[PDB]
Amino acid sequence: LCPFGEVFNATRFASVYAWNRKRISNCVADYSVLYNSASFSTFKCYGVSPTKLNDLCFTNVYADSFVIRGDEVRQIAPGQTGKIADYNYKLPDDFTGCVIAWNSNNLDSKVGGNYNYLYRLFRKSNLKPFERDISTEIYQAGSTPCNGVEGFNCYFPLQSYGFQPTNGVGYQPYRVVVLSFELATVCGP
């Protein structure tokens, strides 16, 4: 059986700027157990039918996990753009797999704000599919060299989220797991 418990019931999730990737292999995968689970608010599949997942079998399966705002959930899809889609986590336009997300306000939000989750605001260019840029260098936005502490046309490219229990839904944290399927290593029952 595949270690889905270690992905969906994980103690902690990574920031979207530095999303975790776990490669799943040599196991039996139960998909309908998730599809029909009341624990999820969003379950959207691309290239595959969610009702046939138990019969389908694949090669490598990658589970990419991270935390974003509810309002940013719409960006986790092929053909979409935005700060997350372009500078944090880019999906290929021919992406094959399913995007699963749920409200984690009662799990991650803290009084005063949980600032352990970051995303990029700035980068020299847009990300390639599944590119994970975790550098901490200062971004320069002009002809002026930085050579030190951020300031004019020099920025620390990351920003934290003020995730709080008093936030509106769009500003509440959501746990997102993207299941990317290549196409016999991972196979359903």
């Epitope: 970051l118 605001l121 901490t136 620390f156 990351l158 934290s160």
Partner: antibody, heavy 109, light 93 residues
Framework: VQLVQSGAEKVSCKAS????????ISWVRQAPGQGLEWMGG????????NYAQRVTITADESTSTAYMELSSRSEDTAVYYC???????????????????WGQGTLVT | IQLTQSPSSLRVTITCRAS??????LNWYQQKPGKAPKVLIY???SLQSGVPSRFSGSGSGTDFTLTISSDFATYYC?????????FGQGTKV
């Protein structure tokens, strides 16, 4: 979001609430009768401190605490403050940086 | 980039001039005796939440002004435009 500094005499600054590794923590010196001087600061996520153009500036995310080590003159007698580097930022172009919180201050003689 | 502010001692206004253009990267602080400084104005003219409407300011490039419509403390201007970061001399109300 408060900053707590060590008492009068290493000089520590513990963060309680708010962001830590995502925001540079700087040290500012204020000798009696004088103005403010920025001496440097560090982003815990980077691990590298930058210095004003003698003093060791470091931080450790695991305890949400910043440190400054002073060693070997009488002319350096001053109150030392820690402060967090915050910014008001808009889309496209980010145009400001300032020091928002600020600890009680450490008296070093 | 050094800052020069005046008058050194004092509705009142305090001005701070940059030796070089610094866009809108200056700020203003209020420091009471024996206490840490607090933020008044950032990004040249934007008020910090909690700051009374009695406080305002504006300017661009080199010439900036802090205005108090009606708090006896020392006020400072700050330069975060470029390294090294610096501060003004301080004006006493």
């Amino acid at each position: 979001v408060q900053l707590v500094q060590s008492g009068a005499e290493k000089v520590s600054c513990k963060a309680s609430g708010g962001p830590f590794s995502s925001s540079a923590i700087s040290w500012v010196r204020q000798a009696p009768g004088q103005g403010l001087e920025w001496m440097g600061g560090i982003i815990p996520m980077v691990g590298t401190a930058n210095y004003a153009q003698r003093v060791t500036i470091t931080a450790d995310e695991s305890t949400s605490t910043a440190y400054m080590e002073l060693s070997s003159r009488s002319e350096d007698t001053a109150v030392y403050y820690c402060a967090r580097d915050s910014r008001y930022c808009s889309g496209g172009s980010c145009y400001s940086v300032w020091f928002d919180p600020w600890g009680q201050g450490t008296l070093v003689t | 980039i050094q800052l020069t502010q005046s008058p050194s001692s004092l509705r009142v206004t305090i001005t701070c001039r940059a030796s070089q253009s610094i866009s809108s990267y200056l700020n203003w602080y209020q420091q009471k005796p024996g206490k840490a400084p607090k933020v008044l104005i950032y990004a040249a003219s934007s008020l910090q939440s909690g700051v009374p409407s009695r406080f305002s300011g504006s300017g661009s490039g080199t010439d900036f002004t802090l205005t108090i419509s009606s708090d006896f403390a020392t006020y400072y201007c700050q330069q975060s435009y470029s390294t090294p970061r610096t501060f003004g001399q301080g004006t006493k109300v």
